[PDB]
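dumping the sequnces here before i forget
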Amino acid sequence: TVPDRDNDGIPDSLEVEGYTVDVKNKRTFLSPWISNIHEKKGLTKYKSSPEKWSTASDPYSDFEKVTGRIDKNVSPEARHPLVAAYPIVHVSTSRTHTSEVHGNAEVHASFFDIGGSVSAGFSNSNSSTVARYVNTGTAPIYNVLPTTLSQILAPNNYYPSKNLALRLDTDQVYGNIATYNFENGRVRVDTGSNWSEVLPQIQETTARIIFNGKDLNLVERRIAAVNPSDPLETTKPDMTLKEALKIAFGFNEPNGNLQYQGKDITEFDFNFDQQTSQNIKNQLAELNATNIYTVLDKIKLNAKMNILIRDKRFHYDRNNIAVGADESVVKE
Amino acid sequence: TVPDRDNDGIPDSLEVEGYTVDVKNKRTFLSPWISNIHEKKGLTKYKSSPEKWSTASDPYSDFEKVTGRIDKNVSPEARHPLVAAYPIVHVSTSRTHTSEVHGNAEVHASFFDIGGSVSAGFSNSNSSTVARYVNTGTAPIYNVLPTTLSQILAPNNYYPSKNLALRLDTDQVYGNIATYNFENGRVRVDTGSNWSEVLPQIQETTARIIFNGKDLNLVERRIAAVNPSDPLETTKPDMTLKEALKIAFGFNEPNGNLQYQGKDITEFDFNFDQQTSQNIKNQLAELNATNIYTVLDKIKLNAKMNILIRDKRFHYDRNNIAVGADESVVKE
Amino acid sequence: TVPDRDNDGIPDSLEVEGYTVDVKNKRTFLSPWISNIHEKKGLTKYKSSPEKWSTASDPYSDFEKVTGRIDKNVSPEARHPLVAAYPIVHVSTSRTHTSEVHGNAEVHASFFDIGGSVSAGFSNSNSSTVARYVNTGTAPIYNVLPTTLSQILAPNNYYPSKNLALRLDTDQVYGNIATYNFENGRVRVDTGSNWSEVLPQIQETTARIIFNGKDLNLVERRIAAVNPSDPLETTKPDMTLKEALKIAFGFNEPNGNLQYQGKDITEFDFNFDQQTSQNIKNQLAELNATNIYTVLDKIKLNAKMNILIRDKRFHYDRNNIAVGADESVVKE
Amino acid sequence: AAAAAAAAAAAAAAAAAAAAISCRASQDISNYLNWYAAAAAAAAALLIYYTSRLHSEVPSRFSGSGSGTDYSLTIAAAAAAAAAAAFCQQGKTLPWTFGGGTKL
Amino acid sequence: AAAAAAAAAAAAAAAAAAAAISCRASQDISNYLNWYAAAAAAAAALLIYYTSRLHSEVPSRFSGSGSGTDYSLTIAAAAAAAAAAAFCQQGKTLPWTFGGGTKL
Amino acid sequence: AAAAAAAAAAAAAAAAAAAAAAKASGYIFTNYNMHWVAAAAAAAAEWIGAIYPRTGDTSYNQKFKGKATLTADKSSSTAYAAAAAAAAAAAAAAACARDGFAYWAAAAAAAAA
Ligand SMILES: [Ca+2]
Ligand SMILES: [Ca+2]
Ligand SMILES: [Ca+2]
Ligand SMILES: [Ca+2]
Ligand SMILES: [Ca+2]
Ligand SMILES: [Ca+2]
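..and the predicted 3d for all of it:
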């Protein structure tokens, strides 16, 4: 037998040492991570918290996320136990950022200087700019529309169909939660459970990373990171920035260099909050490396940590929209 | 004993290797598929997912679909475990399609070219054109009418009787679900359960194929296909285009050639979405066969896959109505 | 012990081989059908489905129908397990039929020709003609009146008493279902259960036969017939037209000839729908007998089968009312 | 009402050749066809009903086939060639109309 | 419609040097490239489809590679140097356009 | 393994059209469609078109819209190519091939001197 203290359906020893799901003959079953057999088939090693039913505090458990016993509308990026699965809803409108400070100094200063005079205000409240509801998150909204009915708002989909039909401080009032039933494949929406009772936990226990590498659109992803103060948060597996980027934004390295659709990691700029920059700078000083891009594999992530990653070749503004770029790139 | 991990009432070994239902003396019982005895009596080999209570994610299970312990209003085409059972409701009106691109090029170009400049926009939202509610699906709607009371709307039937009594973007707001009780033959409608909580799962886990071989009417059928990304979706049995056509649209082959009411398969034209065409083209290139009609038995179906099949001898428009045809066919 | 897979309270072996209920000393108990003892006392052999709690899909089970543990308002014609027990409600008004085609040809053509140019449209929706609610069915309506309160509408009874107090497309909106309790003789009406959730199943699984041999009134009775497509429907016992007439309309044969109150079977005319006529003609051709009246014992009944039986000596119209008759019969 | 016609009314001399006696009706027939054998002014009886199955009192050498409008009866191994008219009767609707043919 | 061009059409004399026969198309190709071998006016057949995998009836010494617009086939150990034209066919869209090359 | 055997030689009059035939016994003819391609000097190899034998459906190049017509006969399991308005520019070797261009025939080498 196995202890499985978290009662997630996965043995805690497997959740610690690493585990993966493989199918032999159309039948799924968990197995401890074994090299030279699971790696060659593209299976991803999964690490979870042995004392948490859900590592990212989202309503879906580690077993449901990994084995596929989850709502099929959940984005594949959230199938990792260490990636939060929560909805983000919005309404020539585009996604916006609360405030930005970096931009007055050199764009290449992030290689040698981290934090200090550069920062970015982060607010968990949804916001948008103008000059139709869209779910840019990884979880659905079922029965309640937000404030700026049986149909849902699937992620990466608009509430009205495309064929059908200066700030907007959209509120985070979401609907109930669709929880997968264990006795049968049927999925039911628990009226008592609400998203508004789950979002605060995800915000507290996860580190938020925002990326705009595709279509110049800000995608909000959160990774379950370790908080040393809380003993339960320590049970989470160690998370590095390289691994967080690989499991959240689809970053891949074929030869030790992070790439995103052919774009190298050095092509992007890193922004941090006040506390995030202080923690990152402390880690850099302890590791004797002012440069951060080349030490990404040895930089640990903590809770209440916010990281903003932009594109260097585009010129940004206070609201984080690529209003302009360099002369060479716009010409060709 | 048998494992039956999915708790569907059918052994998982039977669900993998194939199974069928036969009656000896007015009594039904499952049996593993055995050739030379079950084939000669017209029994159809059934394959299901060993880890899913319902392979197509519809509220009816594999046991209920096969053994007949299902609501009798369900269309016989949906009795296969691999065919989704969900309602489609509409209102000289006729069924319409969202958008069409193929038609500018040669009608025979599908034999040698797949995808590229030819595609078709697909939207799951119900739509119709004009110049009375009709259920063209395979599942009933019981207590809630859609938006463009005890009686139901049976499939292939009008909400008012025939004796009784330019777009219509009908919404997918359906009613509750009539679930067959196991303790007795009585059927009861679960108020808590709703169709709107089941339709999204069916859309995500099934591949939609639209056919207009009878009465020039678009019938919407979905087949449970394998999604490699999700481990649970991999448990579904391998599905080919030939088998999907045979089990959904009634296609039959007496001598290795697919026929529909005497019409050969080559008489129909194949249309695909952008992702569908890319996947089909990848399979064709891997199999070293530009032609698709003669490799239908070796073309696998995946999730989120949309295929549109039309009639070549009719001339179609942007809304997919046979406005005209060739001179010879209209003359005779 | 006995298997009793259907959990109807009757052993499945008894339900297959035949069974009957007899009383020894004021005590009832089931017994397998034994000839020369049960036949001489007028007991009727009962055959049911071993895998169905209720053979006719009506809310009353085989045990309740046969043993008398049923609501006493149920008509004795519905006490047979193979006869559906569902209400029919209506309002010089009289019962009407949707449409009739037979009548242009010879009245005696049914002996040598079946189907083809003769048919009759059938609709399950209630209808009536004019120039007070009446229950012509076999089951009661308790708490909800139909659309064109504690008292009920008993079958063969008017909603108002007789002493008390051009089409009417009455809807099939009935009330709840009075289910007999097993722990005690008390009868209770289940608010959750509704007739509208049971009528569709009865329509799908039973074959409807309409008769007007008494008072020139159309009585609507349905007999549970075998549907080869559905494996569960195959579990029903084989039903012939002769047996269906005997168990539904009270037809009796003392010397091998069917009679109804002294009127021979040949005095009535047979009408069928399109599918019914096609199936009947196929059976007749296979059995090498164009005549149908003399092969009634070897004609099997299937599901979704509608048969209309009229009186030859009366002249009928499109609405199926005996507006006139022959000169000889009206004179005497 | 339903006129019955045969694609071939007289069989040309063709030893060891494919044999098929076809019947083309005025309209479609749902396989309600009968096949009739008869000796020389004697032994008039049918062999196949519903165009596929035998009378069960005749040997299996007779075999009919077809679908739609054209139905053809084939002979596996012919044993004699004499003057004996054949019949081809449909059963879709009244009246009963017969056909014709010359074989065996 | 999709013009096919080769970065190198003639191979200069370079003994024991890196070998790469590249093809640059008019637009991007989703790895729908075919490689064709042919002896002296005989033995015309393909070797690699989808730019990566072999025909399975040919030895593994042939190995193609590439991504995007430029696809290059490399030779591990050359054994002969004769006059034999090569072909470089794309399969993205109609019509099928071939290429060219000189190796082996 | 697949081989195509044709006539060793053919004698024709001056300025007389000729038809090239290639047997397709190496596989199921009605299953895989057969393409036609020709190689000419100063223009490399240009695709001509393809024929689907089961239904006779064809697709032709923009250059070869009316240059050639391709048909097939299931009786002897072979396909035929017919060329109209023959000229000096039409003198080029044509080789047919199965679906995917996997199997190639043995085209003749015409030489006048
Ligand atoms: Ca665990
Ligand atoms: Ca865990
Ligand atoms: Ca199972
Ligand atoms: Ca299953
Ligand atoms: Ca029983
Ligand atoms: Ca029973």
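Residues 54 and 68 of chain D are 19 Å apart (CA to CA).
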